Design goal:
Chains A, B, C, D: It comes from Thermococcus sp. (strain JCM 11816 / KS-1). Four copies of one chain form a homotetramer. Chain A is mainly alpha-helical and about 110 residues long. The first copy, chain A, has a single domain, classed as Helix Hairpins. Chain A is about 75% helix and about 10% strand. In chain A, β1 and β2 form a beta hairpin. Chain A is rod-shaped, with a radius of gyration of 24 Å. Chains in contact: A-B, A-D, B-C, C-D. β2 of chain A pairs antiparallel with β1 of chain D, so a sheet runs across the interface.
Chain lengths: ~110, ~110, ~110, ~110
């Protein structure tokens, strides 16, 4: 019968742990990506308004007057922030893919017929 | 005893896979249908306003002035979009119902007493 | 040993089914109750406004002008609706409690020592 | 073999029950903390507005005019409320940590080699 050594069974278990970890990182990345897409869409729309357009912003359950330039600035900052977060998550994702690649190769090498 | 052949056991398994797949498609269809109903209700209400009615729209956390005609147009587009999506999902649903019908018939034919 | 007859085992199973069904009805009732409480709070607040107070209402992502009297009326209707729904759910709940009471009594009578 | 007495097995079970209970209390505390942080941020922002700034508030799906001072007051009250709630939850949390500490010590003492 095929005899998977205890150390390889351990690698198989860790491979599954990494897969679950990657699934989470990807879900975190996608949430950030969705928010980033929405923010960019909002900025695009606000930027198309005439400079003297009336603009209000929400502060919790409150609504106060703001201006086109201020809303644009606050949206740029939100986008800046989300992109920094997105990059960090993509770096974590890339690291996980590499660990999965390397561990998969080690398992295949260990189980390869002599 | 009743002896369900391995191939029929496979059909029974696929039948369950299709059922789970249909459940999902139906949930996707219902989410689209709910959004479509809400959009139609909103359009109905906006269309009942006097042509010179004051209208504001939300852009993310911001609020800007718009007009009755522009809001109506944007709502028509949303509805147009949702209906295209709804039809595609209904086509997927119909396909799944037919596969379930045909596979159920094959299982019954295979297990029918000689 | 204690020998629970097959029919009593069936009653025990149905008792659990009713319990799960009641749990759901209660959750439905509580969601309706929460919405009703929020609507009443909103009506209370709007009714305290001066008759000439400026009021806007949301229609999806849009905001249009309304009046104090119109908002009050629409809130009364929402409350009317929720109360009708709440009563129906409470009637279902009462029915379930009675079935649980009666089935529990039947099980205890069936298992009572001779 | 190691023989965990029935009473210690009971303590181990209760330890796990307390852990699950603490997990919940912590989740409740964190929800309150998030709301408190958001409210403080909103108050900070509203307080930075000029005294004559125009302010509207939402009442359900409605929007009515308010004032800077009134919004500030209502936010202070919300924060006051959340802090009272936060403290109560932190008191429950501290109690749970102490029970976990004491029960862990009892288990270790009971299982300690003679």
């Amino acid at each position: 019968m095929q005899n998977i050594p205890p150390q390889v069974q351990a690698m198989l278990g860790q491979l599954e742990s990494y897969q679950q970890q990657l699934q989470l990182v990807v879900q975190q990345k996608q949430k950030v990506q969705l928010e980033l897409t929405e923010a960019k869409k909002a900025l695009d729309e606000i930027e198309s308004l005439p400079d003297d357009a009336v603009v209000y912003k929400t502060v919790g359950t409150l609504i106060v007057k703001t201006t086109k330039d201020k809303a644009v600035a606050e949206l740029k900052e939100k986008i800046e922030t989300l992109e920094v977060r997105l990059n960090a998550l993509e770096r974590q994702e890339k690291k996980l893919n590499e660990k999965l690649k390397e561990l998969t190769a080690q398992i295949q090498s260990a189980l390869r017929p002599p």
